[PDB]
Amino acid sequence: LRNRVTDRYFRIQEVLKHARHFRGRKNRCYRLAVRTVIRAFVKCTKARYLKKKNMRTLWINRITAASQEHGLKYPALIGNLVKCQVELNRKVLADLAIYEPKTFKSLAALASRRRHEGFAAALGDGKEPEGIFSRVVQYH
Amino acid sequence: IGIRLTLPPPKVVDRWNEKRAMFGVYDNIGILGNFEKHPKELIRGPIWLRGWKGNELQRCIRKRKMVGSRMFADDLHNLNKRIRYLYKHFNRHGKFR
């Protein structure tokens, strides 16, 4: 046996270290461990997409809850805030709902106010003055 | 577990023994010595391998030709079979044809 692997222990250990926390023979038997570890790593890579997605649905759920406290629906809040030219993302709005409820009520008030301005503009077809909060800051 | 639990005894190599110190001397016997001798003559080994190179099959044919008559019966039989097998492999088998 002119050449034979002397470092096989370490090669096994590289895979096995990731398998320690598994249950059953997967944690210790290399043949089984390697297969589960490949799956673990693949899942880990694909989970990044889901993490981002799940955070956003969580934020929307929380925003919905907080809006509903003020009698406003989720689409109403987000839509009207955008129309007020305020650009607050869903993460921050959810944070505000939890931690700054007075600020959130203010934002809910603003959204509601803008919503009524929209309805008044829609009802008042033709030549009518623009809503006070409806008017938009122009950038050039 | 196929790993040793103690260090192997340390290897001491005399880099300046006579064999290593005088290695390569007379390699240029021809060019510095009026071409009286070829460097190939300095090669010490089997009769059939002195200053010649070839693949396994070529080597076997050469061995059979040169020292075949002096060989032991069992060794000669093995060499015959080896040639016979290598013939079939090199002529009839492979990727490129």
């Binding site: 034979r4 002397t6 470092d7 370490f10 | 790993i3 040793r4 639990l5 260090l7 192997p8 290897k11």
Partner: peptide, 26 residues
Amino acid sequence: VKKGFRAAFRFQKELERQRLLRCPPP
């Protein structure tokens, strides 16, 4: 018994770490 030094050395280092972890010095 496999010829070589590097693997044995590496393993000695591993055992050293294991000994240190098992029995930490004061």
